[PDB]
Amino acid sequence: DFAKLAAAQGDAIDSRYHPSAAVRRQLNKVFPTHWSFLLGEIALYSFIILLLTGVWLTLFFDPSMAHVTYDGVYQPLRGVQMSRAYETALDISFEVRGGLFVRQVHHWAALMFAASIMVHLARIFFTGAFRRPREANWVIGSLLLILAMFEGFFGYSLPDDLLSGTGIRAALSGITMGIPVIGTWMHWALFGGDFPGEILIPRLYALHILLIPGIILALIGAHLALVWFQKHTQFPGPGRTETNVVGVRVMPVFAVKSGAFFAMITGVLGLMGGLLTINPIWNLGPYKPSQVSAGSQPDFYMMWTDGLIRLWPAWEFYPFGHTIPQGVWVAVGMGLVFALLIAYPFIEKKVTGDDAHHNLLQRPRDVPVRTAIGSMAIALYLLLTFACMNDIIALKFHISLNATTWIGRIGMVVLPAIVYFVAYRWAISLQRSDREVLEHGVETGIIKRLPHGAYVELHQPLGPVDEHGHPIPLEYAGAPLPKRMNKLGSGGAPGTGSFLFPDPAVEHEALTEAAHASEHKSLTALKEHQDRIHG
Amino acid sequence: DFAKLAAAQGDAIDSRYHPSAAVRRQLNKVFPTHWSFLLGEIALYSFIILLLTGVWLTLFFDPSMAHVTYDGVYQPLRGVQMSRAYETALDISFEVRGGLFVRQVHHWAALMFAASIMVHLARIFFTGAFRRPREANWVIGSLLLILAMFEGFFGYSLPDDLLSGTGIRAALSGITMGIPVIGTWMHWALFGGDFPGEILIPRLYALHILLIPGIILALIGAHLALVWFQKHTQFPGPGRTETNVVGVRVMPVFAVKSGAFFAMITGVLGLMGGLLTINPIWNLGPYKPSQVSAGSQPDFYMMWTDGLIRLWPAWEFYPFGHTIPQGVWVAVGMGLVFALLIAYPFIEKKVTGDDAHHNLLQRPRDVPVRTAIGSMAIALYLLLTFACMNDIIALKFHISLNATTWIGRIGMVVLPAIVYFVAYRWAISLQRSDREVLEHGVETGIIKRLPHGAYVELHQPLGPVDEHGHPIPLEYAGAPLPKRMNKLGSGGAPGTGSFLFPDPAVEHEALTEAAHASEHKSLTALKEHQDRIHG
Ligand SMILES: CC(C)=CCC/C(C)=C/CC/C(C)=C/CC/C(C)=C/CC/C(C)=C/CC/C(C)=C/CC/C(C)=C/CC/C(C)=C/CC/C(C)=C/CC1=C(C)C(=O)c2ccccc2C1=O
Numbered sequence A, B: 001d002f003a004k005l006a007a008a009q010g011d012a013i014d015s016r017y018h019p020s021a022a023v024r025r026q027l028n029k030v031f032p033t034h035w036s037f038l039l040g041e042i043a044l045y046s047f048i049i050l051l052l053t054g055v056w057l058t059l060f061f062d063p064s065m066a067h068v069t070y071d072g073v074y075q076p077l078r079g080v081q082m083s084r085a086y087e088t089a090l091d092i093s094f095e096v097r098g099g100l101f102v103r104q105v106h107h108w109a110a111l112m113f114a115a116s117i118m119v120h121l122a123r124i125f126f127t128g129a130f131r132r133p134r135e136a137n138w139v140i141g142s143l144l145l146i147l148a149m150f151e152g153f154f155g156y157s158l159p160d161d162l163l164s165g166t167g168i169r170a171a172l173s174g175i176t177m178g179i180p181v182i183g184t185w186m187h188w189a190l191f192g193g194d195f196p197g198e199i200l201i202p203r204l205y206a207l208h209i210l211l212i213p214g215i216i217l218a219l220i221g222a223h224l225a226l227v228w229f230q231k232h233t234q235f236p237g238p239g240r241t242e243t244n245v246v247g248v249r250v251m252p253v254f255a256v257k258s259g260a261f262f263a264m265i266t267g268v269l270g271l272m273g274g275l276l277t278i279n280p281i282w283n284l285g286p287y288k289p290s291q292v293s294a295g296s297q298p299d300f301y302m303m304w305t306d307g308l309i310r311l312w313p314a315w316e317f318y319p320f321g322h323t324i325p326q327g328v329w330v331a332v333g334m335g336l337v338f339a340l341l342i343a344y345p346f347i348e349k350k351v352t353g354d355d356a357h358h359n360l361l362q363r364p365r366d367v368p369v370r371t372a373i374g375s376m377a378i379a380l381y382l383l384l385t386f387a388c389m390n391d392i393i394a395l396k397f398h399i400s401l402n403a404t405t406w407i408g409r410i411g412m413v414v415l416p417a418i419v420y421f422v423a424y425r426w427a428i429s430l431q432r433s434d435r436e437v438l439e440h441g442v443e444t445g446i447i448k449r450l451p452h453g454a455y456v457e458l459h460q461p462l463g464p465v466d467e468h469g470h471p472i473p474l475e476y477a478g479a480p481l482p483k484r485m486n487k488l489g490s491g492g493a494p495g496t497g498s499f500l501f502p503d504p505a506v507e508h509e510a511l512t513e514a515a516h517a518s519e520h521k522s523l524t525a526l527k528e529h530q531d532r533i534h535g
């Protein structure tokens, strides 16, 4: 008797505790059903997959520089001096069933985690989901993005490898040791001595399995709690105002679709872990200071820092008996990037002057300057990311390496400006398109007027029509407009039988009539709620 | 203008978010001010200190069996093959400034964590805090205790040492291989091979710094949330009923005293880490299968399992072509111990019939059978612990080793019975003493009657006095009774000046009558609330 068991367990729960009111509040909480609001959920799910795979990896990984001859199963690396970290990473890859798959899906989950954090940041920045409220949420999210970047940096550096060890030698050692006043001191504190210090990988292992992931988990908890109790903002729409949340309740629809999205995201990650090879450490021999490859790139999230290193024009300063290497330039650049990213909402509010409590998002077109600035920043980030890849770009796409380097150098001041101007004008022209649609109706097929040979597009007004043909122009309301009769009630009722065969006419008529009635009911409910709110 | 800054920050917080009602609820939450309710806080604080010191330790610890010659500073161990784990533990002890202190305070915090968990378990069990509302809390707390025990095991097993290594060899390896159908398979899965498998310490390091601490943190969060929302139970008292919490609010008093208690617990643990030497691994050479020591004990929280191993009388069964060693006996014993501990509240309610919502604690005297059973269990646990220590007990206290082993064997069935009987009768006699006080008043000095030579103790009634000398007996209300006029309004007004010199008589009188007024005001307020609840 499952129903009896469920009722008895509910009574027991509500007797031991009294969670009825709180649980009802959680279930009734309404969440907007916009697709762009699942971008953060992508990052959350990738983080969960990262945790689950990381536990499995920690069950088999041994962090240490203690030198060992492989004497394992991978023949091409046998009798070669390697660290225990590399040896156990190879053991995971080869001598543990499914270990290669687990580490590959872990690395793919890391890449998706970074990418989805970046896409979520784009969404919130361009839709203005940070101003007045949620500004602290944006701040902690920026901290979270930085932590994710460095977490992946320590992760793919964890198995002592030629590629990743070269990346460590470049960034962690050179940049740290070039910093003027305390650079060498920070280097020695971090590495326990010179660069190959015997504690680097154990320290990174601690940082990467417990310390940084613990902070990421705490900040994700704060992030999700803030989103939960500072009700999710929504785009302007029919019944959507600054003092309501139009969407679907947590229990029936939102919960099921979020769980299904989690399932699909982990399916994509597993499929990629299987079919796409990520970080073949067996190909990448053990780290040796004397050995190196030509690629020498970090993961795509640190690729912009690496590209900054490559592009910056070798400017070094030599004060009285001292040196200020080019590493400090990139270090200060990263510091500025992170400071600006963290402090943007406060910078934006100081500049514009808007401290009003904003709960309705604004379409990126409706804010030309901010969308222009975001496009400029994304252009700079892409420029740096491809500058880091200039080696392979030059190799495959036949362009001289010096040409790629100088293309990056010139573009990082030219391309951001070009993209800013183009994005600003593009946003304003999207606004102009919205206004033309508002004042003339949607466009359709052309008709030749009866008496004379006039051609008229035969528009379709979106609002009340004046006594004569032309309609009364509507006022923009911050919400998307239908620019194709395609997406309106025009040519959208195919025979509802099947792909191969029809259904009985009675069933088809019943189905289509019921669907039309449901559409009428939904639109009327939205219209009446909107009228009640604004009247 | 700190006041203005605080006001502006509060307004900004209440504008961005709306935490006014929730924060007021948290601040106004009332917590009973009984000392025994700080026992769980002791464990929580020791856990926090454990986290803080463990992060520092992981910054310097390298888990690996990779063999290395020390070549450090510690002269007595130079050129000796040791695992990198032992080498880095020695590096923490000697090479790192304050590393010895950090690891010692970490181990002392582990011992205090186990001890305070045990004391808190005793408190709740004997006071009946596990009844209907909080059996789930009891269950998760039992899981927490088990996790704490095993994490301490893995923690003092992390630095591969002679003592910890032989303890691992005995408990983990032997008792795992002993298990009949899957013992050897479990051993091979855990160690990745034979006992000295080269993944054991990395696996334990992961389990100990990330996995088990994560589960313990989640369970402590659930525990504290349950205590917070299922308002803390309280002992019977003047104004205390099953539907109220008499105590102090969170903000002014409880928060301050809890923070101060955490400070003092940290101070005790730091003082111990300084003055008392805990696990001096340097005296203990690196683990070798051949080297041994006479002591060979685990930490006190696993000493009971070790004592079970020692005492259980070598009963092995040999099915058709197989063996069932004596280790499986102890494995089943531990299983039974944990199962009974976790399932006691449900066992208690099945036995007694209590399905009532209990919010008033029971005095251990007021619940004899449960008090007797708890005393019996504590006696068994102490017998097992001292049986594990029987080696050192025999060495120092001159008792034959065989004599101690057989004392343990006989007493593990005799001492529990003796302690059960004694505790049951002791509880009933405490009840009898309480009723004697209720019916005769508190006892005082003797007086010789005027006409004849009778001697009367000159009692002091605690309630209304009959028309004649003898008082009207009061009804027992589950609250402690004052058996000394010491603790009542008698002999409690020393000169309030100072230790060496007095104060002006006007000041002394003002202070003393102010205190008298305050204490009688408190008594009257409690009395009025008690009368108001029913009257
Ligand atoms: C720092 C910086 C940007 C320096 C400049 C160097 C650079 C990137 C130049 C552009 C690269 C191109 C497009 C070369 C082709 C020749 C060329 C320049 C033609 C004119 C360009 C132009 C304006 C054309 C008009 C129409 C148009 C927009 C055409 C674009 C055509 C292309 C190539 C589109 C895709 C862009 C693209 C993927 C460029 C390479 C960038 C990267 C990082 C590829 C990564 C990558 C590589 C490198 C693999 O080898 C590989 C092997 C197996 C599986 C996967 C991959 C993989 O994903």
Ligand SMILES: CC(C)=CCC/C(C)=C/CC/C(C)=C/CC/C(C)=C/CC/C(C)=C/CC/C(C)=C/CC/C(C)=C/CC/C(C)=C/CC/C(C)=C/CC1=C(C)C(=O)c2ccccc2C1=O
Binding pocket: B383, B386, B387, B388, B389, B390, B392, B393, B396, B397, B399, B403, B404, B405, B407, B408
């Ligand atoms: C399994 C099992 C319990 C087997 C029996 C072995 C055993 C514990 C026998 C009892 C030990 C005793 C009390 C020996 C003294 C001789 C004796 C038996 C006298 C008769 C006992 C009796 C009924 C006396 C009447 C009055 C009475 C109650 C006297 C008790 C006297 C004592 C010793 C009280 C304290 C109890 C106690 C600490 C016993 C030893 C237990 C342990 C584990 C001590 C651990 C310990 C040791 C071993 C150190 O060397 C040490 C060195 C430096 C700093 C700290 C320590 C430290 O903590």
Ligand SMILES: CC(C)=CCC/C(C)=C\CC/C(C)=C/CC/C(C)=C/CC/C(C)=C/CC/C(C)=C/CC/C(C)=C/CC/C(C)=C/CC/C(C)=C\CC1=C(C)C(=O)c2ccccc2C1=O
Binding pocket: A041, A049, A052, A053, A054, A056, A098, A101, A102, A105, A224, A225, A227, A228, A255, A256, A257, A258, A259, A260, A262, A263, A266
């Ligand atoms: C060789 C080898 C080892 C292979 C394995 C690889 C490995 C190591 C690990 C991966 C293996 C596993 C275990 C994969 C599956 C992971 C997993 C749990 C998937 C669940 C998805 C699934 C099976 C769905 C079935 C379809 C179905 C009926 C769905 C509805 C019922 C379900 C499952 C609902 C789940 C709801 C859900 C995702 C809860 C997540 C809980 C968390 C952390 C947060 C909740 C939460 C969410 C989800 C928000 O979006 C949100 C947005 C704004 C503010 C707050 C929140 C918030 O608090």
Ligand SMILES: CCCCCCCC/C=C\CCCCCCCC(=O)OC[C@H](COP(=O)(O)OCCN)OC(=O)CCCCCCCCCCCCCCC
Binding pocket: A340, A344, A347, A350, A351, A352, A353, A373, A376, A377, A380, A416
């Ligand atoms: C990849 C790209 C790089 C990354 C890009 C992200 C960084 C943030 C982006 C842009 C910041 C500059 C914005 C433009 C600032 C406008 C200047 C001005 O002239 O002030 C006019 C305003 C309007 O006032 P109004 O009553 O509307 O009158 C209309 C008059 N025509 O005045 C004010 O309130 C504000 C005056 C002071 C503003 C100070 C803002 C900067 C604070 C320091 C942070 C560092 C900035 C880094 C810059 C890159």
Ligand code: HEM
Binding pocket: A047, A050, A051, A053, A054, A055, A057, A058, A061, A089, A092, A103, A104, A106, A107, A110, A111, A113, A148, A151, A152, A154, A155, A156, A157, A158, A159, A208, A209, A213, A216, A279, B210
């Ligand atoms: C929080 C976000 C995280 C990110 C972005 C991340 C990223 C990465 C990446 C990219 C790798 C390289 C894998 C490879 O090269 O095969 C890695 C390795 C590893 N990660 Fe993480 N990780 C995260 C969290 C975790 C967690 C929570 C754990 C433990 C529970 C963990 C444990 C490990 C281990 C043990 C390795 C070494 C595997 C190997 O050497 O192949 N990671 N991580």
Ligand code: HEM
Binding pocket: A210, B047, B050, B051, B053, B054, B055, B056, B057, B058, B061, B089, B092, B103, B104, B106, B107, B109, B110, B111, B113, B148, B151, B152, B154, B155, B156, B157, B158, B159, B208, B209, B210, B213, B216, B278, B279
């Ligand atoms: C939660 C309860 C915990 C308990 C009961 C516990 C217990 C112990 C004990 C008794 C030791 C032996 C120390 C020595 O022999 O000097 C130890 C070692 C260690 N603990 Fe834990 N610990 C806990 C949590 C943690 C956490 C959270 C971390 C990491 C953040 C950690 C990291 C370490 C490390 C790295 C060692 C080895 C250091 C050494 O060998 O000296 N512990 N643990």
